[PDB]
């Protein structure tokens, strides 16, 4: 393709596949990593990377809890690492024996 040109302007400003600081609903005092899954007319679908997708919901691209990745630095507020690398690892199922890892020693 790249044959010929396509010039647009953006609904919101925000884009998919990307990374931005999203102020947890639940608690205003607690910002983490998000991942824009869906851009809406003026909304985007944030998904916290490992929270169970349930979690991800609708947020105003133009909402003021919306921070861009590093807005920790700007205000100068501590930021919070999402869920750990096996917390996210669903449908894992293991069917195999497992060993014992128990067994003192005294005498």
Sequence with gaps: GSSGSSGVKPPHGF??????????????????VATVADTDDHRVKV????????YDYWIDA???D????????????PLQPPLSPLELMEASEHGGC?????????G
Excluded: Y
Excluded at 98 to 106: A, I, K, R, V, W
């Design 47 to 54: 998904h916290f990377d490992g929270w169970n997708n349930c």
């Design 62 to 64: 133009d909402s003021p």
């Design 66 to 77: 919306i921070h861009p990745v590093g807005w920790c630095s700007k205000t100068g507020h």
């Design 15 to 32: 884009q998919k596949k990307m990374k931005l600081e999203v102020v947890d609903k639940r608690n205003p005092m607690f910002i983490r």
């Design 98 to 106: 497992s060993t014992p890892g128990s067994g003192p020693s005294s």
